[model samples]
Target: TNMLEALQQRLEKYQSVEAAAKAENNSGKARRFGRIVKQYEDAIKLYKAGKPVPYDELPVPPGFG
Candidate 1:
């Protein structure tokens, strides 16, 4: 539940940041925040589906470890 809440918070935070960036006509920051929003959305979906999160480990892939 904590993880889900955290993800939700992050999504909200980025949404606001994106909106602000757009209002200021900063396309670069807006686009970056938009991508971050998508990532948070994806994380929420995976958590709801009981799937393992991709960010819970080191940068190395499973086989490389």
Candidate 2:
């Protein structure tokens, strides 16, 4: 459950990041964070489905690896 929580938390963070970049009209950052947000969404769906999220290696956000 904590994993899900962490993922959800990051989801929000990336959402905020993406939104902020969009607000600033920064397309580059916006695109990057937007992709990260989508990845988190996919990961969240896996968790919600009660399937093993460890089926494959999850991705790290850009510039965070």
Candidate 3:
């Protein structure tokens, strides 16, 4: 149980990092960002296609960072 909870906290940290990465508004990073976003979306779809996923394992959207 503790391991699961720890995993969750780490996941949230990364998700927040991903968001903060996007907030950065640097056009020089735009095109590459598009690719990161695509990867994130694809990860989400894959998770969705699978059987039930744990709450902590949900896919995170891609971010510029």
Candidate 4:
């Protein structure tokens, strides 16, 4: 169940980041959340692949879209 637990943590982290991002009036927090979200996404890929995901493919901070 370790993998399941890890996935749960990542999902919760993503939700927190999402809320922090969508909340109005705090761009700095939103940007920070974006970075956290990126990290969590990379972690998920690693967990699934059984190896570290390359840094290049990690989710990027919002913007530059």
Candidate 5:
């Protein structure tokens, strides 16, 4: 399984959770899950189009003790 396949699986899981949250009438949890759903949706779209997923990685900055 590749990245796309992994994301697809996660999307399915999140969708189920989102639906459950909605059914439970938990507004806050539903909103958070909705955001994750959007992220996965966008990633899937970009991946199917053969484009790189829109994300960045940066080294952790030095921190004070």
Candidate 6:
């Protein structure tokens, strides 16, 4: 449960960042963030499907510490 919940929180952060990047017309950042978002989406799906997911070592979106 901790793994899945952590993935969710990280997902939302990228979602928000992607929106901001798009608002600023930063295609590069938006694309990168979008990719990260997709990974989490897949991770969530794979995790729900009882598959092994590296949600703990998730991708770090641009400008993220």
- Candidates 4 and 5, the one with greater lDDT: 5
- Model 3 collision count: 0
Per-candidate clashes come to: 0, 0, 0, 0, 0, 0
| TM-score for each candidate, following the candidate numbering | 0.80, 0.79, 0.38, 0.57, 0.79, 0.85
Summarize candidate 6's per-residue lDDT along 1-65 as a digit string, tens digits.
59889889989999999999999999998998999999999999998999998756679745585
Top candidate by lDDT: 6
Q: Could you tell me which residue pairs clash in candidate 4?
A: none
Any runs in candidate 5 off by more than 4 Å, and if so which? 55-65
- Candidate 2 lDDT over 1-65, as tens digits, reads 58889998878888988998999999998998888788889888989998767535555657642
Worst 10 residues of 5 by lDDT: 56-65
Alpha-carbon local distance difference test for all models: 0.74, 0.81, 0.49, 0.64, 0.75, 0.88
Lowest lDDT 10-residue stretch of candidate 2: 56-65
**What does candidate 4 score in Cα RMSD to the true structure?**
7.3
Q: What is the C-alpha RMSD of each candidate to the true structure, in Å?
A: 7.9, 2.6, 7.5, 7.3, 7.6, 2.1
Which has the higher lDDT value, candidate number 3 or candidate number 5?
Answer: 5
Per-residue lDDT of candidate 3, residues 4-63 (tens digit): 454445445555554655688644444444554444444445555764435453434464
10 residues in a row with least lDDT, candidate 3? 56-65
Model 4 stretches with alpha carbons more than 4 Å out: 1-4, 53-65
Model 1 has an lDDT value of 0.74
Q: How far off is residue 48 in model 2, in Å?
A: 0.7
